[PDB]
Each structure stands twice: as structure tokens, then as C-alpha cells.
Amino acid sequence: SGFRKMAFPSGKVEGCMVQVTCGTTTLNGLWLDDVVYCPRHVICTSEDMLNPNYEDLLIRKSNHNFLVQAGNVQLRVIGHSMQNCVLKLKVDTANPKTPKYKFVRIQPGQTFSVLACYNGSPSGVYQCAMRPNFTIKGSFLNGSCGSVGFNIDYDCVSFCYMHHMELPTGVHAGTDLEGNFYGPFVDRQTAQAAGTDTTITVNVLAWLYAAVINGDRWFLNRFTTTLNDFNLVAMKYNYEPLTQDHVDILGPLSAQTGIAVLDMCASLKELLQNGMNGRTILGSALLEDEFTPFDVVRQCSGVTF
């Protein structure tokens, strides 16, 4: 037993990290088969970042302007293209450590592991949730751009995040591996604010199921609710509305405990309306919102990769 935020084992991703340099600017890239993926702002000087025209900046670059390195070992660039905010560099060597992989675009509330890297060298791994305002509460210093976020299922690495930016509030923003930002952000040196954040309801419900599984069930009430009435009251407390997909991903936890999803919603509603009244759940006075239903199952059951 025990409940911990847990990262996926990072080895399959470590074997894909490289560095990409254009001029004096070095950041991280992801080497899969014979392509390296990295943030397109590698082509910019610090002064270019104030108001970059990427298309015009990239026309001035050739294959021979890109230095891609696996450690000290140079991989020759043989082609380049831009896809949204990511640069794809074709290299002359297929990565022998390429895992089975997919590129996925995640939803708010989904969690992933971040492999923080500097100069192509992995430094640490931690777990993040995509917030409803499309930021993550990460830990990233100068040099971290191009670090990736991912999930593992069986043998397949699903890459979902590439790091680009730190907002003035100290939270982080980036793209999927097709280079589309999560949220309304742009890769320009401007002050950019995220929307007001909300609490990830589906994950709170997962954590209440985790509590029940562990015999901590004082908060289970005798009511139910409709999904619509729940969503309307939830929004008053700065909680996200539930989607049908949220209801579906809570299905296994509902089956395990015998507590209907909408009955758990009614329990959560009472917690929001009345508070905890000096009580705790899983040892905490705060409702946790960065464990998904999958995070609860996979950690309670011990799935490997």
C-alpha cells in the first residue's frame, strides 16, 4: 500500500533526448527514428524573440545551420520543416533506442511524466497535470525548452507535451508534439496570462474513490444528483463541469466500490456546500485534484511497462 505521485520509468524517453543548437541557442530535442523534434524558437536570437517572423527566419536557415548532438556525437541534419511551433529535423541516423510511440493531445486533468533535460541530458522526472487553464505547475529552468511529457501504456510511449515557456506567475506552457500550443499562448517574448484556473472535478472524484477503497468513507451521503445539476453547482465553487468521458473513466472505480458516479457527485456536492467540518480524507484537509482515475487504478494495482 501507500499513495504517492509517481512518474513513469523514464528510460525509454531518456534514450531519445538530444540537443539542438542554432547559433548560440541550445535546447532539447526528441530523436525518434530519423527525425528530431524541437521547439521552433531554437532559430531565434534573444532579440528575435520580441517579435519573431518564423517563416522569414526559417527561410534564412539551411540544414547546415543546425547542430544536433547525442551527447558530443553530431547527427547530420539532412532536411528541415516547421509544423506549427515545432521544428522537425531529418537526420542521417535512425535512433536505435526508438521505442514504440504515439503523439497524443491530452485534455485538462490528464497527468503525465515530465523528463526535465538540459543540453540533452536528463536531470529529473516528475508528474504534472494539465490544468483547466492549459498551464502546468512544472519545474523548469533556463535550458529546459524541448523537454517532453509522456505517458506509457504497455510498451508504447505516448508523448503529449513539449516545453516552451514560463508565464509571469511561474507556471508553464507548451505544445503537443505536432507543435500546437495547449491554451491561448504564443512563442513570442511577451507577457502572457492564463485564464483563471479551476479544480479538476474528475480527479477529485477519483481521489474520493481512492479514499473509499482504503476504508475512509465518512463523506458518503444518502443522496444522488443528475449530471447537469451537479455541473451547475460545481461551477459555482470554481470546479470544472464533468463530461461524458469523465463519467466513463470513473466507471472502473465505481464498479470496484459499488458507489455510482452520480452518488459520488452528490457526496462531493455536500463537501463543497458544507465543508469538511474539521475532518480529513486520506490524511488531508484539502481535496487533491492531480490524480486521475487511471493514476488511482495503476498505483493501487501495480501495472508495469
Ligand X SMILES: *[C@](O)(C(=O)NCc1ccccc1)[C@H](C[C@@H]1CCNC1=O)NC(=O)[C@@H]1[C@H]2CCC[C@H]2CN1C(=O)c1cc2c(OC)cccc2[nH]1
- Binds 122, which of ligand X, a copy of itself, none (CB < 5 to 8 A, cut-off by type)? a copy of itself
Binding site for ligand X (CB under 6 A): 25, 27, 41, 49, 140-145, 164-166, 168, 172, 187-191
Pairing of strands 111-118, 100-103: unpaired
Phi, psi torsion values for 85, nearest 5 degrees? -95, 15
Q: Which stretch binds a copy of itself (CB under 8 A): 6-14, 101-109, 180-188, 238-246?
A: 6-14
Tell me the closest approach of the beta carbon of residue 64 to a copy of itself, in angstroms: 27
**158 part of the interface to a copy of itself, by CB under 8 A:** no
Strands (E), 119-219: 121-129, 148-153, 156-166, 172-175
Q: Site for a copy of itself (CB under 8 A): which residue of 54, 101, 140, 161?
A: 140
- Binds 187, which of ligand X, a copy of itself, none (CB < 5 to 8 A, cut-off by type)? ligand X
Closer Cβ to a copy of itself, 3 or 181, answer by number: 3
Closer Cβ to ligand X, 109 or 179, answer by number: 179
Could you confirm whether 41 is annotated as catalytic? yes
For residue 183, the 8-state DSSP code is S
Rounded Cα distance between 192 and 299, Å, is 36
Binding characters for a copy of itself, 190-219, by CB under 8 A (x = yes): ------------------------xx----
Tell me the closest approach of the beta carbon of residue 173 to a copy of itself, in angstroms: 12
- Binds 191, which of ligand X, a copy of itself, none (CB < 5 to 8 A, cut-off by type)? ligand X
Cβ–Cβ < 8 Å for 117, 212 = no
Rounded Cα distance between 194 and 256, Å, is 37
Tell me the closest approach of the beta carbon of residue 113 to a copy of itself, in angstroms: 8
Spacing of C-alpha 127 from chain mean position: 8
Tell me the closest approach of the beta carbon of residue 268 to ligand X, in angstroms: 29
Phi, psi torsion values for 262, nearest 5 degrees? -70, -25
Cβ–Cβ < 8 Å for 131, 137 = yes
Cβ–Cβ < 8 Å for 166, 175 = no
The active-site residue out of 16, 22, 38, 41 is 41
Sheet of strand 73-75: strand arrangement: 73-75, 67-70, 17-22, 25-32, 35-39, 86-91, 77-83
Interaction residues for a copy of itself, span 90-129 (CB under 8 A): 115-119, 121-128
Indicate the helix (H) or strand (E) that contains 86.
Answer: strand 86-91
Phi, psi torsion values for 219, nearest 5 degrees? -80, -5
Catalytic residue ranges: 41, 145
Q: What is the binding site for a copy of itself (CB under 8 A)? A: 1-12, 14-15, 115-119, 121-128, 137-144, 166, 170-172, 214-215, 280, 283-286, 298-299, 301-305
